[PDB]
């Protein structure tokens, strides 16, 4: 009912760019010798720094908000992995242009440290999406609203409990990231962003068969984990194995 606040109303992606996180330190010890087990639970450590952020970004998020909270929730635990991997492919191809694996400022990975943290061949998976960053010359913009669809990337097997708000709200910022590649090859790149949008999911499956293992194995392997994650965990693994997790694709 208001011409001005309507024209002054700042746009969903201008939005997304005020509310994104400030980069989490990992508080990483330079001190201890870079062992696996002493490089994952560091990893593990930052993970629950970063995802207390997540919560707070989700929270103020256009759309996500209206969800019901026992939707929010489990969009957050379905997806925290796959926010995660593509957060730190985005920030090493931002702050080193895809050279290292830019975790946090004080944990930039090299290959000596992607050896040593025994989760080589999924770090290479991780930078690999950096790499096609790079290809693509990914803007933040696209970048913000390509996270957005992450965390609506996988429901419950039967459905949200307001299905029809959620699938309404993942329409919307389709069409934001649609709008954002506006022409000539403006279908071929949003074609290129939600193909790699997709293979995120096979690459967010390995890093939870990773990431569940250790966490069964925790004690024998001497991998530590805090509160946050082991909360998400706790309720996230049994869903996932037990097949009540379903991923959203473009395509297939
Ligand atoms: C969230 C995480 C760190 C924060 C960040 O910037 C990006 C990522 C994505 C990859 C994630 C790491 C972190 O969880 C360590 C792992 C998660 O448990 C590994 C373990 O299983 C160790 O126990 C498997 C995959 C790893
Ligand atoms: C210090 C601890 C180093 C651990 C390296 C673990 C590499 C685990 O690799 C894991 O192996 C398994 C074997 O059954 C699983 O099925 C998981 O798919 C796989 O990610």
Not at 94 to 99: A, E, I, V
Not at 153 to 180: V, W
Not at 229 to 244: A, M
Request: charged share 20%; aromatic share 12%.
């Amino acid at each position: 009912l208001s011409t001005i606040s309507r024209a002054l109303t700042p746009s969903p992606v201008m939005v997304l760019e005020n509310i994104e996180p400030e980069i989490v330190y990992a508080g990483y010890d330079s001190s201890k010798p870079d062992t696996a087990e002493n490089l994952l639970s560091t990893l593990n450590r930052l993970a629950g720094k970063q995802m207390i952020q997540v919560v707070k970004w989700a929270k103020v998020l256009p759309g996500f908000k209206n969800l019901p909270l026992e939707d929010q929730i489990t969009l957050i635990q379905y997806s925290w992995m796959s926010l995660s991997s593509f957060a730190l492919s985005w920030r090493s191809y931002k702050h080193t242009n895809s050279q290292f694996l830019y975790f946090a400022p004080d944990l930039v990975f090299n290959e000596e440290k992607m050896h040593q943290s025994a989760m080589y061949e999924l770090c290479q998976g991780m930078h690999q999406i950096s790499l096609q960053f790079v290809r693509l010359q990914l803007t933040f913009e696209e970048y913000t609203i390509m996270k957005v669809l992450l965390l609506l990337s996988t429901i419950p097997k039967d459905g949200l409990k307001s299905q029809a708000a959620f699938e309404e709200m993942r329409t919307n910022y389709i069409k934001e990231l649609r709008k954002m590649v506006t022409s000539g090859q403006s279908w071929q790149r949003f074609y290129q962003l939600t193909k790699l949008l997709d293979s995120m999911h096979d690459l967010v499956s390995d890093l939870l068969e990773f990431c569940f293992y250790t966490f069964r194995e925790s004690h024998a392997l001497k991998v530590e984990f805090p509160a946050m994650l082991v909360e998400i965990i706790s309720d996230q693994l049994p869903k996932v194995e037990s097949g009540n997790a379903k991923p959203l694709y473009f395509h297939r």
